Amino acid sequence: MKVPEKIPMKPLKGPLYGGYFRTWHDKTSDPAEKDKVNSMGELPKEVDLAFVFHDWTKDYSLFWQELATKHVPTLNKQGTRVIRTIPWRFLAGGDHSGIAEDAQKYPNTPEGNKALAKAIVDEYVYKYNLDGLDVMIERDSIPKVNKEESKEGIERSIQVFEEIGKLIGPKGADKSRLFIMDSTYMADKNPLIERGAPYIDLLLVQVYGTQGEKGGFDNANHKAVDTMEERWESYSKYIRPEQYMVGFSFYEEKANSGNLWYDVNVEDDTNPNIGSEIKGTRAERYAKWQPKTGGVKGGIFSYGIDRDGVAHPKKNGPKTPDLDKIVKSDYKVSKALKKVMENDKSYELIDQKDFPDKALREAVIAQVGSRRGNLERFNGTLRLDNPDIKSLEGLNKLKKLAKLELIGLSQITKLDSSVLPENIKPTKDTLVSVLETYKNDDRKEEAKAIPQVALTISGLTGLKELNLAGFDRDSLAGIDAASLTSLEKVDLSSNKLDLAAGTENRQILDTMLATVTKHGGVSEKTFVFDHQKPTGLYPDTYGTKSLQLPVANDTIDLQAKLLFGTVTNQGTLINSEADYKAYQEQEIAGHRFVDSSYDYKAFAVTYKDYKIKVTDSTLGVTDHKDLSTSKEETYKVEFFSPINSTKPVHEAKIVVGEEKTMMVNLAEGATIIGGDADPTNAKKVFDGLLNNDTTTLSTSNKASIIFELKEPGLVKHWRFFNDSKISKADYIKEAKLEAFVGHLEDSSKVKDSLEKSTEWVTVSDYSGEAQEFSQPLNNIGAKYWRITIDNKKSQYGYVSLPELQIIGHRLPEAATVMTTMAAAEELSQQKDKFSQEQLKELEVKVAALKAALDNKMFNADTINASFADVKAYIDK
Numbered sequence: 036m037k038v039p040e041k042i043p044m045k046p047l048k049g050p051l052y053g054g055y056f057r058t059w060h061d062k063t064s065d066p067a068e069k070d071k072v073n074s075m076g077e078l079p080k081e082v083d084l085a086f087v088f089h090d091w092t093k094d095y096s097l098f099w100q101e102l103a104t105k106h107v108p109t110l111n112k113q114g115t116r117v118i119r120t121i122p123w124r125f126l127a128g129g130d131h132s133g134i135a136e137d138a139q140k141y142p143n144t145p146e147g148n149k150a151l152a153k154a155i156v157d158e159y160v161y162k163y164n165l166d167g168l169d170v171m172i173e174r175d176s177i178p179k180v181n182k183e184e185s186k187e188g189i190e191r192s193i194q195v196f197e198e199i200g201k202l203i204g205p206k207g208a209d210k211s212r213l214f215i216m217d218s219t220y221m222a223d224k225n226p227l228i229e230r231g232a233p234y235i236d237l238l239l240v241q242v243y244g245t246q247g248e249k250g251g252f253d254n255a256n257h258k259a260v261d262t263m264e265e266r267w268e269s270y271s272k273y274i275r276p277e278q279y280m281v282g283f284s285f286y287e288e289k290a291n292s293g294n295l296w297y298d299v300n301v302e303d304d305t306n307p308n309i310g311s312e313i314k315g316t317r318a319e320r321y322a323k324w325q326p327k328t329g330g331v332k333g334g335i336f337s338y339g340i341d342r343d344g345v346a347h348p349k350k351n352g353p354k355t356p357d358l359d360k361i362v363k364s365d366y367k368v369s370k371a372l373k374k375v376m377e378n379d380k381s382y383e384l385i386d387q388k389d390f391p392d393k394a395l396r397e398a399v400i401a402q403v404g405s406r407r408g409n410l411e412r413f414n415g416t417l418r419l420d421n422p423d424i425k426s427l428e429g430l431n432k433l434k435k436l437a438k439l440e441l442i443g444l445s446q447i448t449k450l451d452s453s454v455l456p457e458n459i460k461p462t463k464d465t466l467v468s469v470l471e472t473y474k475n476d477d478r479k480e481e482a483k484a485i486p487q488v489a490l491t492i493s494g495l496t497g498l499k500e501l502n503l504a505g506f507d508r509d510s511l512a513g514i515d516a517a518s519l520t521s522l523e524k525v526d527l528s529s530n531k532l533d534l535a536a537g538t539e540n541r542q543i544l545d546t547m548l549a550t551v552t553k554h555g556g557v558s559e560k561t562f563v564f565d566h567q568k569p570t571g572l573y574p575d576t577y578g579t580k581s582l583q584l585p586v587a588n589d590t591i592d593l594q595a596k597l598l599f600g601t602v603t604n605q606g607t608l609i610n611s612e613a614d615y616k617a618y619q620e621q622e623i624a625g626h627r628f629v630d631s632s633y634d635y636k637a638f639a640v641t642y643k644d645y646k647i648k649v650t651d652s653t654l655g656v657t658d659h660k661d662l663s664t665s666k667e668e669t670y671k672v673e674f675f676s677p678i679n680s681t682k683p684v685h686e687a688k689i690v691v692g693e694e695k696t697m698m699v700n701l702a703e704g705a706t707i708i709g710g711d712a713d714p715t716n717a718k719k720v721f722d723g724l725l726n727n728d729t730t731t732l733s734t735s736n737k738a739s740i741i742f743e744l745k746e747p748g749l750v751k752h753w754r755f756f757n758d759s760k761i762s763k764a765d766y767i768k769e770a771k772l773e774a775f776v777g778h779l780e781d782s783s784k785v786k787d788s789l790e791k792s793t794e795w796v797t798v799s800d801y802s803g804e805a806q807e808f809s810q811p812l813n814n815i816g817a818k819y820w821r822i823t824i825d826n827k828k829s830q831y832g833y834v835s836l837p838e839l840q841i842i843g844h845r846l847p848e849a850a851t852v853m854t855t856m857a858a859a860e861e862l863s864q865q866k867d868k869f870s871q872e873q874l875k876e877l878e879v880k881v882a883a884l885k886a887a888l889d890n891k892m893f894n895a896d897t898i899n900a901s902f903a904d905v906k907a908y909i910d911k
């Protein structure tokens with residue numbers, strides 16, 4: 036075969052139309068199938084990308100010679116690129132993986148994967164001198180080994196994809212060949228987009244059918260999911276909008292359910308041409324659809340373009356087997372869809388009517404895009420730093436700009452709303468979607484707010500008038516006032532500026548005031564900044580983090596003492612209405628700036644649905660604002676916004692009386708050793724959730740858990756909870772807590788049979804009916820514990836235990852420090868073992884360890900030193 040060499044082609048410019056041509060429907064595929072009558076060479080010039088979608092066509096078929104020698108030159112001559120489509124798994128190996136099936140020639144190694152990528156491009160692109168490669172990423176094409184999805188092949192395919200992108204596409208050695216990805220997945224479910232996106236020219240999304248258009252439906256929340264907008268936004272993270280193309284499907288002959296998309300017109304007996312009409316079809320909606328932000332899309336594509344013109348069979352209606360007949364297409368749908376996009380307002384070119392100043396016009400086209408549709412949508416930064424710009428006329432056409440930077444524009448004299456973006460002030464989105472929505476959603480959300488453009492002004496040395504009045508600007512940041520040396524008239528009134536003393540805003544205003552006054556002729560019309568309504572925000576930090584209070588019979592409001600206040604975005608704190616009026620009466624050059632109608636409750640934030648969490652030193656937890664001080668206790672207090680209930684906005688330590696150390700739950704995350712309780716729910720006893728009704732029931736009616744403290748310490752308290760308010764009179768009514776006495780029976784390899792067989796010590800026997808029980812404990816230092824609970828119900832009582840807490844202080848080998856001390860008075864209440872005056876030099880050291888251990892401020896290093904030096908006085 037002699038393959039002709041590449042034909043000069045005019046560059047691709049959107050809007051683009053693409054088509055997947057099924058090879059088995061080309062005349063030359065199987066000469067025996069006389070019904071196969073179409074030809075890929077017959078595709079019209081309106082088709083920019085003809086995709087070779089291969090199946091059923093034999094390796095030896097004369098189609099491949101026809102493609103390379105006739106079709107490609109014919110299509111290239113008219114500007115149509117011919118793209119080879121291959122499935123995802125061709126990049127992975129394993130089942131049905133094309134070239135990659137030869138795992139010995141192309142091993143899964145760094146050099147083997149480099150070789151596979153070169154082989155893939157040589158075989159599927161260069162062999163017939165095609166114009167690019169399209170990798171199809173869907174479940175249909177996922178890497179598989181023995182009919183099983185292969186995570187290993189998926190990982191390999193990521194590597195091979197990058198290697199291909201170094202050969203072709205925008206980052207490749209041969210930039211004259213397109214590297215294209217199509218996918219059914221949302222971007223977060225596309226395993227290859229994050230690494231593959233820099234290497235591709237175009238991204239195609241298959242969104243066939245009403246569910247591609249509207250998204251799926253969330254049955255519970257009754258909302259659309261994976262909408263066209265949400266799909267684009269997921270990929271906007273990775274590609275530009277002009278790289279984005281969306282796909283519909285023609286009606287494939289003899290299609291099953293699950294392959295019926297209704298993307299083109301349903302047949303009608305009384306109009307045999309209705310399949311070639313496009314108005315109102317999903318296909319035309321896709322042609323007209325545009326993202327709401329970012330920019331205009333790259334175009335659209337069709338699957339099965341050889342079926343162009345065939346009407347779709349009716350959903351509910353008697354069969355029409357005539358639609359399954361194979362007829363030669365005239366590609367009328369494809370021609371009309373291309374013309375719909377080419378004639379759309381969105382793809383109108385930005386010209387002199389929009390920006391008369393060519394220097395400005397060239398800056399917008401370079402940065403925003405050449406199409407008028409981008410003015411409506413562009414979402415990033417427009418930097419204007421060419422000093423040749425003599426006019427900003429046309430900037431009002433930018434509707435969604437995130438940042439406008441005006442730098443060094445010497446010859447601009449005035450700035451107001453006529454030469455500024457339309458979103459300098461609050462605006463709502465005005466673009467209307469052309470897509471059908473869910474009838475079962477009633478979705479007409481009113482016109483999302485457009486975030487306002489951030490404005491930077493630096494070096495406009497000829498700027499004489501700066502009018503930003505009535506735009507609800509949040510700050511003046513970005514205004515390099517010292518550089519605006521020709522200002523004569525400034526209006527910043529009717530915004531949201533905190534212009535208080537010490538703010539950054541005030542300094543920019545004061546710098547401009549100096550400039551304007553030095554010019555002279557200052558009147559009441561010349562420098563106006565009043566009617567400000569600055570937004571009141573929640574303070575980031577609060578002033579009170581520690582409070583020592585005396586023991587007294589009184590209740591305090593913790594929220595009133597610790598959490599209040601409102602700040603502006605410049606840091607001006609207001610406590611109360613009294614403080615606010617002082618702020619409201621501030622003056623700049625003898626003139627108040629805060630709007631007089633903007634009262635305190637309009638400005639102040641509220642702490643209505645803020646929650647409080649108060650934990651004492653024994654880890655008892657309440658959510659009460661009011662705290663008694665009659666009892667001597669040390670508390671941790673945390674406040675939670677309703678917006679985040681896991682994560683406090685403010686924390687404070689309140690000491691009542693002498694300070695006590697905050698204890699810890701040493702049984703938190705304890706490992707289950709033994710007992711008869713259900714192992715899954717037994718673990719949930721120590722996870723940390725006091726309302727852990729993930730079914731915390733341990734057995735039928737009487738349960739036991741043997742557990743090991745993950746890192747033992749000094750135990751002084753314990754607590755357990757019955758199912759919080761979910762049940763009553765099913766409560767645990769009897770409980771016994773036991774500690775193991777450091778006597779592992781010479782079988783440390785087993786440690787379960789040993790504990791279920793030794794003699795323990797009972798640290799507490801609970802009998803009662805409280806929802807929650809807590810109790811002090813006598814400095815136990817055991818690593819191994821057993822809890823036994825009983826709700827006194829029938830043998831099918833299904834006793835439950837949401838949490839158990841073993842509470843104390845972290846101190847490794849606390850077992851030793853109580854073994855030694857226990858013997859310290861098994862030796863000092865009996866005289867004359869070593870007894871001399873040494874006995875009272877013992878007793879001063881035993882009285883100092885019981886004092887060190889039983890101290891409210893637990894200091895581990897103090898006890899060690901007291902423990903270590905009592906240890907020294909035994910051998911002597």
Ligand SMILES: CC(=O)N[C@H]1[C@H](O[C@@H]2[C@@H](OC[C@H]3O[C@@H](O[C@H]4[C@H](O)[C@H]5[NH+]=C(C)O[C@H]5O[C@@H]4CO)[C@@H](O)[C@@H](O[C@H]4O[C@H](CO)[C@@H](O)[C@H](O)[C@@H]4O[C@@H]4O[C@H](CO)[C@@H](O[C@@H]5O[C@H](CO[C@]6(C(=O)O)C[C@H](O)[C@@H](NC(C)=O)[C@H]([C@H](O)[C@H](O)CO)O6)[C@H](O)[C@H](O)[C@H]5O)[C@H](O)[C@H]4NC(C)=O)[C@@H]3O)O[C@H](CO)[C@@H](O)[C@@H]2O)O[C@H](CO)[C@@H](O[C@@H]2O[C@H](CO[C@]3(C(=O)O)C[C@H](O)[C@@H](NC(C)=O)[C@H]([C@H](O)[C@H](O)CO)O3)[C@H](O)[C@H](O)[C@H]2O)[C@@H]1O
Nearest residue numbers: 089090122131132133134136175176287288289290291294
């Ligand atoms: C390429 C590849 O890979 N392939 C693969 C595949 O894949 C797949 C595919 O797909 C396709 C499809 O598609 C669809 O669509 C869709 C798409 O997909 C997507 N995409 C896009 C963008 O969008 C989306 O969606 C869409 C829609 O949905 C569709 O289109 C379809 O179509 C169909 O359907 C429709 C409706 O619906 C219609 O309309 C159409 O038309 C169609 O239909 C069809 O048609 C056809 C035509 O005709 C038919 O056919 C059949 O055929 C047969 C044949 O046969 C024979 C033989 O074979 O032998 C012949 C002879 O002649 C005879 N003889 C005498 C007569 O004497 C014989 C007989 O039978 C005797 O008797 C014996 O007994 O035979 C027959 O004829 C029958 O009958 C017929 O029927 C059919 O049927 C129809 N169907 C219906 C249902 O209707 C389409 O289809 O593709 C893609 C891309 O590419 C992918 O992704 C997917 O996934 O898959 C499969 C499964 O698995 C496979 O298969 C297999 O294969 C094997 C072989 O292979 C291989 C290995 O070896 O592995 C592969 C690799 O790669 C390669 N390479 C390398 C390694 O390198 C290889 C080579 O070639 C060498 O050889 C080796 O070395 O290969 C085996 O065969 C087995 O068996 C199987 O299973 C495949 O592969």
Ligand SMILES: [Ca+2]
Nearest residue numbers: 719724727837
């Ligand atoms: Ca729990």
